[PDB]
Design a binder for this molecule. Structure first.
Ligand code: ALF
Ligand SMILES: [Mg+2]
Length: 603
Protein backbone atom coordinates (compact mmCIF):
# COMPACT_ATOMS: atom_id res chain seq x y z
CA UNK A 1 0.00 0.00 0.00
CA UNK A 2 2.97 2.29 0.69
CA UNK A 3 5.46 0.71 -1.75
CA UNK A 4 5.08 3.93 -3.77
CA UNK A 5 7.61 5.74 -1.54
CA UNK A 6 10.22 2.95 -1.84
CA UNK A 7 12.02 4.11 -5.04
CA UNK A 8 12.58 7.48 -3.36
CA UNK A 9 14.23 6.05 -0.22
CA UNK A 10 16.28 3.52 -2.19
CA UNK A 11 17.46 6.30 -4.52
CA UNK A 12 18.45 8.44 -1.50
CA UNK A 13 20.44 5.68 0.24
CA UNK A 14 22.03 4.44 -3.00
CA UNK A 15 23.03 8.05 -3.74
CA UNK A 16 24.63 8.87 -0.39
CA UNK A 17 26.42 5.50 -0.40
CA UNK A 18 27.64 6.08 -4.01
CA UNK A 19 29.19 9.28 -2.68
CA UNK A 20 30.73 7.21 0.11
CA UNK A 21 32.30 5.09 -2.64
CA UNK A 22 33.57 8.25 -4.30
CA UNK A 23 35.34 8.65 -0.97
CA UNK A 24 37.49 5.49 -1.41
CA UNK A 25 38.22 4.03 -4.88
CA UNK A 26 36.52 6.52 -7.25
CA UNK A 27 36.19 4.23 -10.31
CA UNK A 28 34.33 1.66 -8.24
CA UNK A 29 32.12 4.52 -7.03
CA UNK A 30 31.22 5.76 -10.53
CA UNK A 31 29.81 2.31 -11.29
CA UNK A 32 27.75 2.66 -8.12
CA UNK A 33 26.50 6.03 -9.37
CA UNK A 34 25.60 4.50 -12.77
CA UNK A 35 23.67 1.93 -10.68
CA UNK A 36 21.80 4.70 -8.82
CA UNK A 37 21.05 6.59 -12.06
CA UNK A 38 19.85 3.42 -13.81
CA UNK A 39 17.65 2.16 -10.95
CA UNK A 40 16.07 5.60 -10.55
CA UNK A 41 15.74 5.94 -14.32
CA UNK A 42 14.05 2.55 -14.76
CA UNK A 43 10.38 3.26 -14.03
CA UNK A 44 10.60 6.61 -15.84
CA UNK A 45 12.14 5.02 -18.93
CA UNK A 46 9.56 2.22 -19.23
CA UNK A 47 6.74 4.65 -18.39
CA UNK A 48 7.90 6.98 -21.15
CA UNK A 49 8.38 3.99 -23.48
CA UNK A 50 4.72 3.04 -22.96
CA UNK A 51 3.71 6.63 -23.74
CA UNK A 52 5.57 6.57 -27.09
CA UNK A 53 3.52 3.48 -27.99
CA UNK A 54 0.31 5.34 -27.13
CA UNK A 55 1.08 8.07 -29.67
CA UNK A 56 2.41 10.53 -27.07
CA UNK A 57 6.04 11.06 -28.11
CA UNK A 58 7.06 14.11 -26.10
CA UNK A 59 5.82 13.87 -22.50
CA UNK A 60 8.31 15.15 -19.90
CA UNK A 61 9.22 11.53 -19.14
CA UNK A 62 10.79 11.32 -22.60
CA UNK A 63 12.98 14.36 -21.98
CA UNK A 64 13.96 12.99 -18.58
CA UNK A 65 14.90 9.53 -19.84
CA UNK A 66 16.79 10.80 -22.90
CA UNK A 67 18.69 13.33 -20.77
CA UNK A 68 19.61 10.63 -18.24
CA UNK A 69 20.76 8.17 -20.93
CA UNK A 70 22.86 10.92 -22.50
CA UNK A 71 24.31 11.97 -19.15
CA UNK A 72 25.42 8.36 -18.67
CA UNK A 73 27.70 8.42 -21.74
CA UNK A 74 29.35 11.61 -20.46
CA UNK A 75 29.92 10.76 -16.79
CA UNK A 76 27.37 13.29 -15.58
CA UNK A 77 26.07 10.53 -13.32
CA UNK A 78 25.97 12.53 -10.08
CA UNK A 79 24.02 15.31 -11.82
CA UNK A 80 21.59 12.96 -13.58
CA UNK A 81 21.10 11.27 -10.23
CA UNK A 82 20.31 14.66 -8.66
CA UNK A 83 17.75 15.66 -11.30
CA UNK A 84 16.21 12.17 -11.06
CA UNK A 85 15.87 12.71 -7.32
CA UNK A 86 14.14 16.06 -7.79
CA UNK A 87 11.81 14.50 -10.38
CA UNK A 88 11.00 11.63 -8.04
CA UNK A 89 10.17 14.11 -5.26
CA UNK A 90 7.84 15.95 -7.64
CA UNK A 91 6.17 12.70 -8.73
CA UNK A 92 5.67 11.61 -5.12
CA UNK A 93 4.39 14.99 -3.91
CA UNK A 94 1.89 14.74 -6.77
CA UNK A 95 0.98 11.17 -5.82
CA UNK A 96 0.24 12.12 -2.21
CA UNK A 97 -2.22 14.72 -3.51
CA UNK A 98 -4.58 12.05 -4.85
CA UNK A 99 -8.13 11.19 -3.77
CA UNK A 100 -8.41 7.97 -1.76
CA UNK A 101 -21.05 4.10 -3.65
CA UNK A 102 -21.50 1.94 -0.53
CA UNK A 103 -23.52 4.56 1.39
CA UNK A 104 -26.05 4.59 -1.46
CA UNK A 105 -26.01 0.79 -1.69
CA UNK A 106 -27.09 0.67 1.95
CA UNK A 107 -30.28 2.46 0.89
CA UNK A 108 -31.48 -0.63 -0.96
CA UNK A 109 -32.59 -3.27 1.56
CA UNK A 110 -31.35 -6.82 0.92
CA UNK A 111 -34.60 -8.65 1.52
CA UNK A 112 -38.25 -7.75 1.01
CA UNK A 113 -41.41 -9.20 2.56
CA UNK A 114 -43.73 -10.47 -0.17
CA UNK A 115 -47.38 -11.42 0.28
CA UNK A 116 -48.92 -14.39 -1.53
CA UNK A 117 -52.03 -16.39 -0.58
CA UNK A 118 -52.09 -14.66 2.79
CA UNK A 119 -48.60 -15.91 3.56
CA UNK A 120 -45.49 -13.79 4.23
CA UNK A 121 -42.17 -14.69 2.62
CA UNK A 122 -38.74 -13.09 2.89
CA UNK A 123 -37.25 -12.87 -0.60
CA UNK A 124 -34.23 -11.38 -2.37
CA UNK A 125 -34.90 -7.84 -3.60
CA UNK A 126 -34.44 -8.97 -7.22
CA UNK A 127 -37.04 -11.71 -6.88
CA UNK A 128 -39.61 -8.92 -6.72
CA UNK A 129 -41.77 -8.68 -9.85
CA UNK A 130 -44.13 -5.83 -10.82
CA UNK A 131 -47.57 -6.68 -9.45
CA UNK A 132 -46.17 -8.41 -6.38
CA UNK A 133 -47.63 -7.21 -3.10
CA UNK A 134 -44.84 -6.23 -0.70
CA UNK A 135 -45.23 -5.15 2.89
CA UNK A 136 -43.03 -2.46 4.42
CA UNK A 137 -42.84 -2.24 8.22
CA UNK A 138 -42.81 1.05 10.13
CA UNK A 139 -39.44 2.74 9.68
CA UNK A 140 -38.57 0.46 6.78
CA UNK A 141 -37.42 1.57 3.34
CA UNK A 142 -39.29 0.68 0.16
CA UNK A 143 -37.24 -1.97 -1.73
CA UNK A 144 -38.92 -0.88 -4.96
CA UNK A 145 -41.20 1.72 -6.52
CA UNK A 146 -44.67 0.84 -5.26
CA UNK A 147 -48.29 1.85 -5.65
CA UNK A 148 -49.96 2.25 -2.24
CA UNK A 149 -52.64 -0.39 -1.64
CA UNK A 150 -53.25 0.81 1.91
CA UNK A 151 -56.00 3.44 2.28
CA UNK A 152 -53.65 6.00 3.81
CA UNK A 153 -50.02 6.43 4.90
CA UNK A 154 -47.33 9.07 5.42
CA UNK A 155 -43.84 8.72 3.92
CA UNK A 156 -40.43 10.26 4.48
CA UNK A 157 -39.34 10.77 0.86
CA UNK A 158 -36.26 12.82 1.76
CA UNK A 159 -34.03 10.63 -0.40
CA UNK A 160 -35.70 12.27 -3.41
CA UNK A 161 -36.76 15.70 -2.15
CA UNK A 162 -34.42 16.36 0.76
CA UNK A 163 -37.47 17.07 2.91
CA UNK A 164 -38.12 14.94 6.00
CA UNK A 165 -41.68 16.26 6.37
CA UNK A 166 -43.84 13.13 5.91
CA UNK A 167 -45.98 13.12 2.75
CA UNK A 168 -49.64 12.05 3.02
CA UNK A 169 -50.44 9.39 0.41
CA UNK A 170 -53.67 7.52 -0.38
CA UNK A 171 -54.66 4.41 -2.36
CA UNK A 172 -53.23 4.49 -5.88
CA UNK A 173 -50.51 7.06 -5.19
CA UNK A 174 -47.01 6.11 -6.31
CA UNK A 175 -44.37 5.80 -3.59
CA UNK A 176 -40.70 5.81 -4.74
CA UNK A 177 -38.05 3.32 -3.56
CA UNK A 178 -35.95 4.55 -0.66
CA UNK A 179 -38.99 6.23 0.88
CA UNK A 180 -39.65 5.51 4.55
CA UNK A 181 -43.00 4.48 6.03
CA UNK A 182 -43.01 6.72 9.11
CA UNK A 183 -45.64 5.44 11.56
CA UNK A 184 -47.66 2.56 10.16
CA UNK A 185 -47.19 -0.69 8.29
CA UNK A 186 -48.00 -0.50 4.59
CA UNK A 187 -48.71 -2.73 1.63
CA UNK A 188 -47.73 -1.77 -1.92
CA UNK A 189 -47.90 -3.16 -5.44
CA UNK A 190 -44.37 -3.27 -6.86
CA UNK A 191 -44.17 -1.05 -9.96
CA UNK A 192 -40.47 -1.21 -10.84
CA UNK A 193 -38.37 -4.00 -12.35
CA UNK A 194 -35.28 -5.07 -10.35
CA UNK A 195 -32.46 -2.55 -10.74
CA UNK A 196 -34.91 0.04 -12.04
CA UNK A 197 -36.08 1.75 -8.83
CA UNK A 198 -35.77 5.43 -7.81
CA UNK A 199 -32.56 4.70 -5.90
CA UNK A 200 -31.18 2.84 -8.93
CA UNK A 201 -32.02 5.87 -11.09
CA UNK A 202 -30.09 8.07 -8.63
CA UNK A 203 -27.08 5.72 -8.92
CA UNK A 204 -27.32 5.90 -12.72
CA UNK A 205 -27.36 9.71 -12.56
CA UNK A 206 -24.22 9.67 -10.40
CA UNK A 207 -22.38 7.25 -12.69
CA UNK A 208 -23.32 9.18 -15.83
CA UNK A 209 -22.25 12.47 -14.22
CA UNK A 210 -18.91 10.92 -13.25
CA UNK A 211 -18.44 9.55 -16.79
CA UNK A 212 -19.12 12.93 -18.42
CA UNK A 213 -16.39 14.48 -16.25
CA UNK A 214 -13.51 15.51 -18.50
CA UNK A 215 -10.01 15.01 -17.06
CA UNK A 216 -8.02 18.25 -16.86
CA UNK A 217 -4.54 18.10 -18.39
CA UNK A 218 -1.58 19.16 -16.23
CA UNK A 219 0.32 22.31 -17.18
CA UNK A 220 3.53 20.30 -17.38
CA UNK A 221 2.30 18.07 -20.22
CA UNK A 222 0.84 20.87 -22.32
CA UNK A 223 4.21 22.53 -21.77
CA UNK A 224 6.37 19.46 -22.39
CA UNK A 225 4.51 18.89 -25.67
CA UNK A 226 6.29 22.01 -27.02
CA UNK A 227 9.33 22.47 -24.74
CA UNK A 228 10.58 18.86 -24.93
CA UNK A 229 10.70 18.58 -28.73
CA UNK A 230 12.20 22.08 -28.82
CA UNK A 231 15.24 21.61 -26.59
CA UNK A 232 15.84 18.24 -28.28
CA UNK A 233 15.98 19.98 -31.67
CA UNK A 234 18.33 22.68 -30.37
CA UNK A 235 20.65 20.15 -28.70
CA UNK A 236 20.82 18.34 -32.04
CA UNK A 237 21.80 21.67 -33.60
CA UNK A 238 24.50 22.59 -31.07
CA UNK A 239 25.86 19.12 -31.92
CA UNK A 240 25.60 19.41 -35.72
CA UNK A 241 26.08 23.10 -36.59
CA UNK A 242 29.53 23.70 -35.08
CA UNK A 243 31.58 20.77 -36.51
CA UNK A 244 29.74 21.00 -39.85
CA UNK A 245 30.35 24.75 -40.22
CA UNK A 246 33.35 25.58 -38.00
CA UNK A 247 35.22 22.28 -38.44
CA UNK A 248 35.21 21.74 -34.67
CA UNK A 249 35.49 18.59 -32.54
CA UNK A 250 32.59 16.14 -32.94
CA UNK A 251 33.30 14.84 -29.43
CA UNK A 252 32.95 18.21 -27.66
CA UNK A 253 29.74 19.29 -29.44
CA UNK A 254 28.08 15.89 -29.07
CA UNK A 255 29.05 16.12 -25.40
CA UNK A 256 27.73 19.69 -25.27
CA UNK A 257 24.42 18.71 -26.90
CA UNK A 258 23.78 15.92 -24.41
CA UNK A 259 24.74 18.33 -21.62
CA UNK A 260 22.03 20.65 -22.99
CA UNK A 261 19.57 17.77 -22.83
CA UNK A 262 20.34 17.30 -19.12
CA UNK A 263 20.31 21.06 -18.46
CA UNK A 264 16.96 21.34 -20.23
CA UNK A 265 15.31 19.04 -17.69
CA UNK A 266 13.14 21.44 -15.74
CA UNK A 267 13.36 20.48 -12.12
CA UNK A 268 11.56 22.95 -9.82
CA UNK A 269 8.82 23.01 -12.46
CA UNK A 270 7.80 19.43 -11.66
CA UNK A 271 7.73 20.31 -7.95
CA UNK A 272 6.16 23.71 -8.79
CA UNK A 273 2.44 22.80 -8.85
CA UNK A 274 2.59 19.85 -6.38
CA UNK A 275 4.26 22.00 -3.71
CA UNK A 276 1.41 24.54 -3.75
CA UNK A 277 -1.44 22.03 -3.75
CA UNK A 278 0.15 19.99 -0.93
CA UNK A 279 0.37 23.19 1.13
CA UNK A 280 -3.16 24.26 0.22
CA UNK A 281 -4.72 20.92 1.13
CA UNK A 282 -2.71 21.05 4.37
CA UNK A 283 -3.92 24.59 5.12
CA UNK A 284 -7.59 23.78 4.42
CA UNK A 285 -7.39 20.68 6.60
CA UNK A 286 -5.95 22.76 9.45
CA UNK A 287 -8.95 25.14 9.45
CA UNK A 288 -12.01 22.88 9.47
CA UNK A 289 -12.16 22.13 5.75
CA UNK A 290 -11.88 18.78 4.01
CA UNK A 291 -10.74 18.45 0.41
CA UNK A 292 -10.20 15.12 -1.35
CA UNK A 293 -7.27 15.46 -3.75
CA UNK A 294 -5.59 18.30 -5.60
CA UNK A 295 -7.87 18.33 -8.65
CA UNK A 296 -10.65 19.27 -6.25
CA UNK A 297 -8.55 22.19 -5.00
CA UNK A 298 -7.86 23.38 -8.56
CA UNK A 299 -11.55 23.18 -9.53
CA UNK A 300 -12.34 25.03 -6.29
CA UNK A 301 -9.80 27.55 -7.49
CA UNK A 302 -11.55 28.17 -10.81
CA UNK A 303 -15.12 28.36 -9.43
CA UNK A 304 -17.33 31.50 -9.82
CA UNK A 305 -20.86 30.16 -9.16
CA UNK A 306 -22.52 28.30 -6.30
CA UNK A 307 -25.71 26.24 -6.40
CA UNK A 308 -27.12 25.71 -2.91
CA UNK A 309 -29.42 23.06 -1.55
CA UNK A 310 -31.89 24.72 0.85
CA UNK A 311 -32.98 22.34 3.61
CA UNK A 312 -30.08 21.33 5.86
CA UNK A 313 -27.61 23.38 3.83
CA UNK A 314 -28.78 27.00 4.01
CA UNK A 315 -31.32 26.13 6.74
CA UNK A 316 -30.95 24.12 9.95
CA UNK A 317 -33.31 21.53 8.44
CA UNK A 318 -35.68 21.56 11.42
CA UNK A 319 -39.10 23.20 11.72
CA UNK A 320 -39.34 25.88 14.38
CA UNK A 321 -42.42 27.74 15.56
CA UNK A 322 -42.31 31.36 14.36
CA UNK A 323 -45.70 32.72 15.49
CA UNK A 324 -48.59 31.83 17.81
CA UNK A 325 -52.01 33.41 17.13
CA UNK A 326 -54.73 32.49 19.66
CA UNK A 327 -58.43 33.31 19.61
CA UNK A 328 -59.68 35.98 22.01
CA UNK A 329 -59.94 34.74 25.60
CA UNK A 330 -56.88 32.57 25.05
CA UNK A 331 -53.21 33.38 25.71
CA UNK A 332 -50.41 32.24 23.39
CA UNK A 333 -49.00 30.05 26.18
CA UNK A 334 -52.42 28.38 26.67
CA UNK A 335 -52.81 27.57 22.99
CA UNK A 336 -49.20 26.36 22.99
CA UNK A 337 -49.48 24.30 26.18
CA UNK A 338 -52.62 22.69 24.72
CA UNK A 339 -51.07 21.92 21.32
CA UNK A 340 -48.02 20.52 23.12
CA UNK A 341 -50.37 18.53 25.35
CA UNK A 342 -51.79 16.83 22.24
CA UNK A 343 -48.54 16.49 20.25
CA UNK A 344 -46.39 15.01 23.05
CA UNK A 345 -44.94 11.68 21.96
CA UNK A 346 -45.69 12.25 18.28
CA UNK A 347 -42.73 11.89 15.91
CA UNK A 348 -43.87 14.40 13.26
CA UNK A 349 -41.18 17.13 13.22
CA UNK A 350 -43.87 19.83 13.61
CA UNK A 351 -45.09 18.13 16.78
CA UNK A 352 -41.51 17.95 18.03
CA UNK A 353 -41.12 21.65 17.26
CA UNK A 354 -44.26 22.49 19.24
CA UNK A 355 -43.21 20.36 22.23
CA UNK A 356 -39.77 22.01 22.09
CA UNK A 357 -41.29 25.50 22.05
CA UNK A 358 -43.39 24.54 25.05
CA UNK A 359 -40.29 23.25 26.85
CA UNK A 360 -37.99 26.26 26.32
CA UNK A 361 -40.78 28.43 27.74
CA UNK A 362 -41.01 26.33 30.92
CA UNK A 363 -44.68 25.59 30.20
CA UNK A 364 -45.58 22.37 32.03
CA UNK A 365 -47.17 20.00 29.50
CA UNK A 366 -50.28 18.38 31.04
CA UNK A 367 -50.83 14.65 30.51
CA UNK A 368 -53.07 13.74 27.57
CA UNK A 369 -55.52 10.83 27.57
CA UNK A 370 -56.87 8.84 24.61
CA UNK A 371 -54.28 10.26 22.20
CA UNK A 372 -54.78 9.04 18.63
CA UNK A 373 -54.57 9.82 14.92
CA UNK A 374 -57.72 11.23 13.36
CA UNK A 375 -56.90 9.81 9.95
CA UNK A 376 -56.69 12.35 7.13
CA UNK A 377 -57.52 15.24 9.43
CA UNK A 378 -54.79 15.49 12.09
CA UNK A 379 -53.97 14.15 15.54
CA UNK A 380 -56.43 14.35 18.43
CA UNK A 381 -56.37 13.84 22.18
CA UNK A 382 -58.44 14.80 25.19
CA UNK A 383 -56.81 17.23 27.60
CA UNK A 384 -58.52 17.95 30.94
CA UNK A 385 -61.82 16.53 29.68
CA UNK A 386 -62.23 18.17 26.27
CA UNK A 387 -61.33 16.71 22.87
CA UNK A 388 -58.77 18.85 21.09
CA UNK A 389 -57.48 18.23 17.56
CA UNK A 390 -54.30 19.66 16.08
CA UNK A 391 -54.34 19.57 12.27
CA UNK A 392 -53.09 21.04 8.97
CA UNK A 393 -54.64 24.34 7.85
CA UNK A 394 -56.20 22.70 4.78
CA UNK A 395 -57.99 20.06 6.85
CA UNK A 396 -60.52 22.22 8.69
CA UNK A 397 -62.57 25.44 8.32
CA UNK A 398 -60.42 28.48 9.10
CA UNK A 399 -63.32 30.81 10.02
CA UNK A 400 -61.88 34.19 11.14
CA UNK A 401 -58.28 33.10 10.67
CA UNK A 402 -58.58 32.82 6.88
CA UNK A 403 -56.76 36.04 5.98
CA UNK A 404 -54.09 35.51 8.63
CA UNK A 405 -53.56 31.94 7.44
CA UNK A 406 -53.19 33.09 3.83
CA UNK A 407 -50.73 35.79 4.91
CA UNK A 408 -48.67 33.25 6.85
CA UNK A 409 -48.69 30.62 4.08
CA UNK A 410 -47.71 33.08 1.33
CA UNK A 411 -44.75 34.07 3.52
CA UNK A 412 -43.50 30.48 3.41
CA UNK A 413 -44.89 29.40 6.78
CA UNK A 414 -46.67 26.16 7.71
CA UNK A 415 -49.85 26.63 9.73
CA UNK A 416 -51.55 24.23 12.12
CA UNK A 417 -54.95 24.74 13.72
CA UNK A 418 -55.81 24.03 17.32
CA UNK A 419 -59.48 22.98 17.49
CA UNK A 420 -61.57 22.09 20.55
CA UNK A 421 -65.19 20.96 20.06
CA UNK A 422 -65.20 22.36 16.49
CA UNK A 423 -64.03 25.78 17.69
CA UNK A 424 -60.75 27.00 16.20
CA UNK A 425 -58.80 27.98 19.32
CA UNK A 426 -56.01 29.55 17.27
CA UNK A 427 -53.23 28.86 14.81
CA UNK A 428 -49.52 28.08 15.05
CA UNK A 429 -46.96 29.04 12.37
CA UNK A 430 -43.72 27.09 11.81
CA UNK A 431 -40.78 27.50 9.43
CA UNK A 432 -37.41 25.97 8.58
CA UNK A 433 -35.11 28.87 9.46
CA UNK A 434 -31.73 30.02 8.07
CA UNK A 435 -28.43 28.97 9.64
CA UNK A 436 -26.73 31.67 11.73
CA UNK A 437 -24.05 32.49 9.17
CA UNK A 438 -25.95 31.91 5.92
CA UNK A 439 -26.57 35.61 5.22
CA UNK A 440 -23.03 36.90 5.85
CA UNK A 441 -21.63 33.91 3.92
CA UNK A 442 -23.77 34.73 0.89
CA UNK A 443 -22.77 38.42 1.08
CA UNK A 444 -19.10 37.44 1.23
CA UNK A 445 -19.50 35.17 -1.78
CA UNK A 446 -21.04 38.17 -3.56
CA UNK A 447 -18.00 40.24 -2.54
CA UNK A 448 -15.86 37.66 -4.37
CA UNK A 449 -18.08 37.95 -7.44
CA UNK A 450 -19.50 34.47 -6.82
CA UNK A 451 -23.26 34.46 -7.35
CA UNK A 452 -25.48 31.92 -5.65
CA UNK A 453 -28.59 30.22 -6.91
CA UNK A 454 -30.88 27.86 -4.99
CA UNK A 455 -31.84 24.42 -6.30
CA UNK A 456 -34.35 22.85 -3.93
CA UNK A 457 -36.88 20.03 -4.00
CA UNK A 458 -39.10 21.95 -1.57
CA UNK A 459 -42.32 23.79 -2.50
CA UNK A 460 -42.13 27.21 -4.26
CA UNK A 461 -43.37 29.20 -1.22
CA UNK A 462 -41.05 27.76 1.43
CA UNK A 463 -38.18 28.25 -1.02
CA UNK A 464 -39.23 31.79 -1.99
CA UNK A 465 -39.20 32.88 1.64
CA UNK A 466 -35.58 31.79 2.20
CA UNK A 467 -34.33 32.88 -1.23
CA UNK A 468 -36.10 36.14 -0.44
CA UNK A 469 -34.03 36.51 2.73
CA UNK A 470 -30.73 35.92 0.90
CA UNK A 471 -31.51 37.82 -2.30
CA UNK A 472 -30.94 34.71 -4.42
CA UNK A 473 -32.85 33.24 -7.35
CA UNK A 474 -34.25 29.74 -7.08
CA UNK A 475 -35.72 26.72 -8.81
CA UNK A 476 -38.15 24.75 -6.63
CA UNK A 477 -40.01 21.44 -6.53
CA UNK A 478 -37.03 19.71 -8.12
CA UNK A 479 -36.25 15.99 -8.41
CA UNK A 480 -32.56 14.86 -8.62
CA UNK A 481 -32.56 14.73 -12.43
CA UNK A 482 -33.89 18.30 -12.55
CA UNK A 483 -31.03 19.45 -10.27
CA UNK A 484 -28.55 17.70 -12.57
CA UNK A 485 -30.04 19.52 -15.58
CA UNK A 486 -29.99 22.92 -13.86
CA UNK A 487 -26.39 22.34 -12.72
CA UNK A 488 -25.31 21.30 -16.25
CA UNK A 489 -26.96 24.38 -17.75
CA UNK A 490 -25.18 26.66 -15.26
CA UNK A 491 -21.83 24.81 -15.50
CA UNK A 492 -21.69 25.26 -19.28
CA UNK A 493 -21.70 29.02 -18.64
CA UNK A 494 -19.15 28.96 -15.81
CA UNK A 495 -17.52 26.47 -13.38
CA UNK A 496 -19.92 25.80 -10.49
CA UNK A 497 -19.73 24.42 -6.96
CA UNK A 498 -22.76 22.48 -5.69
CA UNK A 499 -23.40 22.58 -1.95
CA UNK A 500 -25.84 20.08 -0.49
CA UNK A 501 -26.55 17.75 2.42
CA UNK A 502 -28.82 15.20 0.77
CA UNK A 503 -28.91 11.99 -1.25
CA UNK A 504 -30.83 13.89 -3.92
CA UNK A 505 -27.91 16.36 -4.08
CA UNK A 506 -25.47 13.57 -4.99
CA UNK A 507 -26.11 13.52 -8.74
CA UNK A 508 -25.90 17.34 -8.88
CA UNK A 509 -22.63 17.28 -6.94
CA UNK A 510 -21.05 14.99 -9.54
CA UNK A 511 -22.49 17.07 -12.38
CA UNK A 512 -20.82 20.22 -10.99
CA UNK A 513 -17.15 21.24 -11.29
CA UNK A 514 -16.95 20.32 -7.60
CA UNK A 515 -19.47 19.02 -5.08
CA UNK A 516 -19.37 20.21 -1.47
CA UNK A 517 -21.20 18.51 1.42
CA UNK A 518 -22.41 19.84 4.78
CA UNK A 519 -20.97 18.14 7.85
CA UNK A 520 -24.31 16.91 9.18
CA UNK A 521 -25.35 15.78 5.70
CA UNK A 522 -26.31 12.33 4.46
CA UNK A 523 -23.56 9.72 4.12
CA UNK A 524 -24.32 9.59 0.39
CA UNK A 525 -23.69 13.35 0.20
CA UNK A 526 -20.44 13.17 2.18
CA UNK A 527 -19.18 10.31 0.02
CA UNK A 528 -20.23 11.73 -3.36
CA UNK A 529 -18.75 15.16 -2.63
CA UNK A 530 -15.19 16.19 -3.42
CA UNK A 531 -15.13 18.34 -0.28
CA UNK A 532 -16.81 18.75 3.12
CA UNK A 533 -17.87 21.50 5.55
CA UNK A 534 -17.13 19.44 8.69
CA UNK A 535 -18.44 22.30 10.86
CA UNK A 536 -21.65 23.32 9.05
CA UNK A 537 -20.41 26.93 8.98
CA UNK A 538 -21.25 28.33 5.54
CA UNK A 539 -18.58 31.04 5.98
CA UNK A 540 -16.00 28.25 5.69
CA UNK A 541 -17.02 28.12 2.06
CA UNK A 542 -15.61 31.58 1.23
CA UNK A 543 -12.42 30.65 3.08
CA UNK A 544 -12.12 27.55 0.92
CA UNK A 545 -12.72 29.56 -2.23
CA UNK A 546 -10.25 32.13 -0.97
CA UNK A 547 -7.57 29.55 -0.16
CA UNK A 548 -8.01 27.72 -3.45
CA UNK A 549 -7.67 31.00 -5.34
CA UNK A 550 -4.56 31.98 -3.41
CA UNK A 551 -3.25 28.53 -4.23
CA UNK A 552 -3.90 29.17 -7.91
CA UNK A 553 -1.87 32.35 -7.61
CA UNK A 554 0.96 30.65 -5.73
CA UNK A 555 1.36 28.06 -8.49
CA UNK A 556 1.51 30.80 -11.13
CA UNK A 557 4.30 32.51 -9.21
CA UNK A 558 6.19 29.26 -8.64
CA UNK A 559 6.08 28.24 -12.30
CA UNK A 560 7.38 31.68 -13.25
CA UNK A 561 10.29 31.29 -10.83
CA UNK A 562 10.98 27.77 -12.05
CA UNK A 563 10.45 28.80 -15.66
CA UNK A 564 12.32 32.08 -15.29
CA UNK A 565 15.65 30.97 -13.87
CA UNK A 566 15.64 28.04 -16.30
CA UNK A 567 15.25 30.46 -19.19
CA UNK A 568 18.11 32.57 -17.91
CA UNK A 569 20.32 29.56 -17.39
CA UNK A 570 19.16 28.29 -20.76
CA UNK A 571 20.28 31.40 -22.63
CA UNK A 572 23.57 31.83 -20.70
CA UNK A 573 24.38 28.15 -21.42
CA UNK A 574 23.70 28.81 -25.10
CA UNK A 575 26.15 31.72 -24.98
CA UNK A 576 28.71 29.37 -23.48
CA UNK A 577 29.24 31.21 -20.20
CA UNK A 578 27.59 28.59 -17.95
CA UNK A 579 27.97 24.85 -17.36
CA UNK A 580 26.01 21.79 -16.25
CA UNK A 581 26.73 21.82 -12.52
CA UNK A 582 25.83 25.51 -12.32
CA UNK A 583 22.50 24.89 -14.08
CA UNK A 584 21.79 22.02 -11.69
CA UNK A 585 22.66 24.22 -8.71
CA UNK A 586 20.39 26.92 -10.16
CA UNK A 587 17.46 24.57 -10.72
CA UNK A 588 17.96 23.40 -7.13
CA UNK A 589 17.87 27.01 -5.93
CA UNK A 590 14.70 27.46 -7.98
CA UNK A 591 13.21 24.42 -6.20
CA UNK A 592 14.10 25.83 -2.79
CA UNK A 593 12.41 29.08 -3.85
CA UNK A 594 9.15 27.55 -5.09
CA UNK A 595 9.12 25.45 -1.92
CA UNK A 596 9.51 28.47 0.36
CA UNK A 597 6.81 30.22 -1.69
CA UNK A 598 4.44 27.27 -1.41
CA UNK A 599 4.93 27.36 2.37
CA UNK A 600 3.33 30.85 2.41
CA UNK A 601 -0.09 29.23 1.94
CA UNK A 602 0.15 27.88 5.49
CA UNK A 603 -0.11 31.40 6.94
F1 ALF B 1 -32.41 19.93 1.26
AL1 ALF B 1 -33.06 20.15 -0.39
F2 ALF B 1 -33.62 20.37 -2.07
F3 ALF B 1 -33.71 21.75 0.01
F4 ALF B 1 -32.37 18.56 -0.80
MG1 LIG C 1 -30.85 18.63 1.18
Amino acid sequence: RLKENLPLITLIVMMAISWGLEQFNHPFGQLAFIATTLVGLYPIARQALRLIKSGSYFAIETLMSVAAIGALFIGATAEAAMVLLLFLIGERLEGWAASRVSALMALKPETATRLRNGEREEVAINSLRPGDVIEVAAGGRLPADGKLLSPFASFDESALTGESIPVERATGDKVPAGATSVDRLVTLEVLSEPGASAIDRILKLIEEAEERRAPIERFIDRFSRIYTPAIMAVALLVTLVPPLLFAASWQEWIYKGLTLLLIGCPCALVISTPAAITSGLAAAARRGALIKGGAALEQLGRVTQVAFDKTGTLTVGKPRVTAIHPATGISESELLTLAAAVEQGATHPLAQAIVREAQVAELAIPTAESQRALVGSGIEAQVNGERVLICAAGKHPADAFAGLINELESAGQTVVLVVRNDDVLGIIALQDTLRADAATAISELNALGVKGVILTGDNPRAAAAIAGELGLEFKAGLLPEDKVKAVTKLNQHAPLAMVGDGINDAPAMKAAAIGIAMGSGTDVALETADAALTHNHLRGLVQMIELARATHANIRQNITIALGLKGIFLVTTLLGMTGLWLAVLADTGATVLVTANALRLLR
